[PDB]
Design a protein around this nucleic acid. Structure first.
Ligand SMILES: [K+]
Ligand SMILES: [K+]
Ligand SMILES: [K+]
Ligand SMILES: [Mg+2]
Ligand SMILES: [Mg+2]
Ligand SMILES: [Mg+2]
Ligand SMILES: [Mg+2]
Ligand SMILES: [Mg+2]
Ligand SMILES: [Mg+2]
Ligand SMILES: [Mg+2]
Ligand SMILES: [Mg+2]
Ligand SMILES: [Mg+2]
Ligand SMILES: [Mg+2]
Ligand SMILES: [Mg+2]
Ligand SMILES: [Mg+2]
Ligand SMILES: [Mg+2]
Ligand SMILES: [Mg+2]
Lengths: 31, 154, 235, 198, 53, 35, 53
RNA sequence: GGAUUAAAACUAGAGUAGCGAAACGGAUUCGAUACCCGUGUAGUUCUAGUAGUAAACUAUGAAUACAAUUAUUUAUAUAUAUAUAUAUAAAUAAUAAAUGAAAAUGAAAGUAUUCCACCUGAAGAGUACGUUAGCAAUAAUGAAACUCAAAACAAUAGACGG
């Protein structure tokens, strides 16, 4: 796939990583 | 070996595309029978026993001492800027062998697709092996023989 | 008649009077348009417990003998499985004997080398006394001892030459004899074949009946068998 | 747990064939490069004797002191000592010894029994290397492939000549299970047979 | 086509073949053995220059 | 020259002729000829 | 006048070679197909060319 | 199934010059959580492990048989009027034929054969759930619903380019 199409997967991976960092943080405070 | 026969079928197609007058094939009983059938049917100009370096001019007895260096040399025919032997393909493949009764061979020669084998076309040669002998399908039907459908030459 | 199958014993000695036999049958697979072999393992009754893993056997249908047993061994077509068991037992005994013999030949060789290391006398020095005593006339008792260290009772110039002989020398002469034989056999047959008249006579002289009426290959083999019977039997 | 667990790489411990070949390589006067001391002592004595005879035909600096000729012998035996040569030379001698104990006839080097024996010698040497170089993965891969190659040659032997097969594996210290069973020389094997010790 | 594809070696031909092949293996072993002795001789000639004491 | 060589550093020919009774069977032959 | 396409069989080399060994089996070169030599334009050579140089 | 597997990361014990996430400062800027500069913690190093992921790419699985040329190296062999010449292989470059959507491939992406892996519109999604493994980060396995008649590749002529 071209760079243009790769960029869509890049955004999805970024948002998943951002959400998992956010979830981690919560667990630390709630723990 | 059907693998060796597949190699020879592909080799002859390659030689026809470049229009070489003479080429060599492995020296085995099956190859010799295959080549002889093509020669009698007018696909090959010549059929000579020989060595890796070329056809033998004088008879050279084949023994274990020289068996590894033996080859069969065949002459290809070209008329009107067209190869006489244009295509050569196996029907019965190493990983899927096809054995047909004489009744089904008659259907194949009559225009009926049997076991996905496209029927015999005008001017095409289909060879059959029965009891380690290679013959034309029309000849196998005459002798009431059942056998493996090996290849089709056009 | 009762349905009979051929198969290879794939398990034995795990159940009492029961063996597992692998039967392969030929079927047509319409989807891929190919005649395939279909495999199935059968639990089979072995009344005499004769079959062994690896054997080729014929199994015959029988009455129900158990929940899963409906066939019995009817004949051992090939007994490769039984052979394996016999050869394994023999191997243990055969190898033990050979290893014992080789262990005794190794300790003996060690002893001989150790004994020689206890004799300070060296070949060079000993060969320098047999060549000085033989050139000076002195006969110290060392020579008598040397006549025992080597067994050379007589001390002459042709005794030191036989103490220092190297195997390579013998090999060089055996190789020349081998080369001669091959060369002679080839020249003889080559010449014989060139002259049909001398060939026909050659065969008759060696006891062939009407050699003239023979083929090239049927007669050249006779010539070869004779030329190799006139250069290897007489020598 | 009662199964006969024979190490598929090194075979049964104390195998007489493996031990005897190893001992032969460590004997006091073993020489490298195909020389044997007995042939070298006669050859060196022949040179001296031959020189004297050549000096008694065309002859009429005296002779060398024996101590000097003994030092020339000591230099030749130190240069040709197996204990002063590379380990590969010792393995070459072992391969010859193993081949002659398994050959069907003089010159037989391709029979499956001979090939297995020759592979055994190299496997034993390579296994010793790995035990001292446990992080040398390149040569561990070579060992695995070599062990698997020995399995393949012996499996064919079992099919071709069953009697020889059982004799060969017994002499090499292996068992039928070691040959037939799939072997990957994986980490569990290195721990179940204590390949590296501790 | 009628000619046989292969003619097996006669027992005599196999005997001569074995003689030549055994000779070839023996000659090579002998030549290597003699080469080694010739190198041992050339090393003896120079061992007077080597130090062991 | 081979066995009948004058070089201080000779070849295996000399040692072979010695153990093959050639350097001796020629020395006697030459001496017998001189006689 | 050199012949192209002729293979010398081991049966035609009964005597030993310059190395002292007999030939008992085909070598690797003998086992390679040489069809290409049949089609490559032959290199014309003349003895007079050597004298001219 | 097994083994090995960049960088980052992690578990212990050392090391820590230089470099350098982060953090704290200096600038730039309409603003500058950046680009540039400073101080520079983890890390980068070694030893013993965990983990098995990369645009881990030639984006091209492995094996066998075969097909027209040239050039350039390399290797082996042969010859001599001894330094070249003649042979046979390998590699690389440019090609014929053939193949292909074309770009191109070129001894394969050609002519054939054998075996394995994998794919079946886009998005949702390599996500959710479950399971397995790991100290952990995570890795592997891996959907469906809803929605849409899209979505993608090569090439062509333009327009534009700090
Ligand atoms: K029962
Ligand atoms: K640091
Ligand atoms: K694969
Ligand atoms: Mg893609
Ligand atoms: Mg293998
Ligand atoms: Mg790197
Ligand atoms: Mg740390
Ligand atoms: Mg800042
Ligand atoms: Mg600011
Ligand atoms: Mg900074
Ligand atoms: Mg690991
Ligand atoms: Mg990941
Ligand atoms: Mg991946
Ligand atoms: Mg890379
Ligand atoms: Mg391979
Ligand atoms: Mg995941
Ligand atoms: Mg595009």
């Amino acid at each position: 796939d071209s760079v243009m199409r790769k960029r869509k997967k890049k955004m999805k991976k970024h948002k998943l990583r951002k959400r998992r960092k956010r979830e981690k943080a919560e667990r630390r405070k709630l723990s | 070996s059907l693998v060796k026969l597949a190699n020879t079928c592909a080799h002859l197609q390659n030689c026809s595309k470049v229009r070489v007058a003479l080429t060599s094939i492995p020296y085995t009983k099956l190859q010799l029978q295959f080549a002889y059938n093509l020669y009698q049917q007018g696909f090959l100009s010549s059929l000579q026993k020989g060595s890796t370096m070329g056809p033998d001019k004088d008879f050279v007895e084949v023994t274990p001492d020289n068996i590894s260096t033996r080859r069969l040399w065949v002459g290809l025919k070209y008329r009107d800027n067209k190869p006489v032997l244009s295509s050569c393909k196996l029907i019965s493949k190493p990983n899927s062998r096809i054995h047909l009764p004489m009744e089904d061979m008659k259907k194949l020669c009559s225009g009926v697709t049997i076991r996905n084998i496209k029927p015999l076309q005008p001017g095409e040669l289909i060879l059959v092996r029965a009891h380690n002998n290679i013959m034309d399908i029309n000849e196998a039907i005459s002798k009431k023989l059942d056998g493996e459908v090996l290849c089709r030459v056009k | 008649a009762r349905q009979n199958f051929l198969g290879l014993v794939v398990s034995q000695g795990k159940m009492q009077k029961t063996v597992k036999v692998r039967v392969e049958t030929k079927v047509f697979n319409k989807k891929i348009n190919k005649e395939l072999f279909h495999r199935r393992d059968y639990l089979v009754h072995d009344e005499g417990e004769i079959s062994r893993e690896g054997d080729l056997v014929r199994i015959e249908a029988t009455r129900p003998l158990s929940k899963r047993k409906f066939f019995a061994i009817a004949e051992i077509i090939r007994n490769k499985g039984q052979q394996f068991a016999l050869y394994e037992s023999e191997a243990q005994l055969s190898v033990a004997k050979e290893e014992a013999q080789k262990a005794k030949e190794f300790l003996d060789k060690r002893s001989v080398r150790e004994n020689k290391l206890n004799e300070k006398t060296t070949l060079l020095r000993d060969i320098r006394t047999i060549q000085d005593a033989l050139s000076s006339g002195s006969t110290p008792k060392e020579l008598l001892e040397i006549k025992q260290r080597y067994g050379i009772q007589d001390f002459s110039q042709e005794t030191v030459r036989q103490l220092l002989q190297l195997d390579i020398s013998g090999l060089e002469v055996n190789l020349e004899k081998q080369r001669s034989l091959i060369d002679r056999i080839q020249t003889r047959l080559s010449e014989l074949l060139s002259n049909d008249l001398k060939c026909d006579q050659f065969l008759k002289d060696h006891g062939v009946e009407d050699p003239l009426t023979l083929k090239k290959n049927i007669k050249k083999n006779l010539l070869r068998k004779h030329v190799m019977m006139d250069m290897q039997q007489p020598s | 747990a009662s199964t006969d667990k024979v190490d598929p790489v090194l075979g049964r411990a104390d195998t007489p064939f493996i031990t005897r070949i190893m001992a032969e390589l460590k004997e006091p006067l073993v020489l490298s490069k195909g020389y044997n001391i007995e042939e070298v002592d006669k050859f060196l004595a022949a040179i001296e004797s031959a020189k004297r005879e050549r000096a008694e035909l065309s002859g009429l600096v005296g002779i060398e002191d024996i101590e000097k000729l003994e030092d020339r012998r000591e230099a030749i035996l130190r240069i040709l000592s197996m204990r002063n040569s590379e380990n590969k030379n010792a393995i070459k001698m072992a391969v010859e010894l193993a081949r002659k104990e398994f050959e069907r006839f003089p010159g037989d080097t391709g029979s499956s029994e001979v090939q297995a024996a020759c592979m055994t010698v190299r496997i034993q040497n390579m296994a010793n290397h790995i035990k001292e170089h446990r992080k040398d993965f390149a040569n561990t891969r070579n060992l695995r492939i070599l062990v698997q190659q020995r399995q393949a040659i012996l499996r064919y032997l079992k099919r071709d000549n069953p009697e020889k097969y059982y004799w060969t594996i017994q002499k090499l210290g292996l068992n039928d299970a070691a040959i037939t069973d799939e072997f990957n020389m994986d980490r569990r094997y290195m721990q179940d047979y204590e390949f590296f010790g501790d | 086509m009628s000619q046989p594809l292969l003619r097996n070696r006669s027992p005599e031909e196999s005997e001569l073949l074995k003689l030549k092949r055994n000779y070839n293996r023996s000659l090579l072993n002998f030549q290597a053995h003699k080469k080694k002795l010739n190198e041992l001789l050339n090393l003896y000639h120079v061992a007077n220059e080597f130090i062991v004491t | 020259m081979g066995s009948l060589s004058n070089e201080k550093f000779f070849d295996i020919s000399l040692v072979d002729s010695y153990l093959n009774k050639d350097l001796k069977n020629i020395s006697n032959k030459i001496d017998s000829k001189l006689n | 006048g050199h012949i192209i396409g002729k293979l010398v069989d081991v049966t035609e080399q009964p005597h030993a070679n310059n190395k002292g060994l007999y030939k008992t089996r085909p070598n690797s070169s003998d086992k390679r197909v040489g069809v290409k030599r049949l089609y490559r334009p032959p290199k014309l050579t003349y003895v007079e060319d050597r004298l001219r140089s």
